[PDB]
Symmetry: C3
Subunit: 27 residues, 3 copies
């Protein structure tokens, strides 16, 4: 669960979530 690839999965999901929050803030 701590390889580059595993940690990449988690950061990808968080980025997706942040992109959605930012959509509520601006274009």
């Amino acid at each position: 669960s701590n390889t580059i690839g595993a940690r990449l999965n988690r950061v990808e999901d968080k980025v997706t979530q942040l992109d959605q929050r930012l959509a509520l803030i601006t274009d």
Copy 2:
């Protein structure tokens, strides 16, 4: 996609997010 491709992808997306937030605040 491959780990290499996905790492480039996220790095550039994070930059994009930062640029979009910056246009509004900071």
Copy 3:
């Protein structure tokens, strides 16, 4: 830099964006 360093950096940038955005919206 190395793949590990790049991932550490992107994680770092994401934490920072997360905290800023969390002040603005849930």
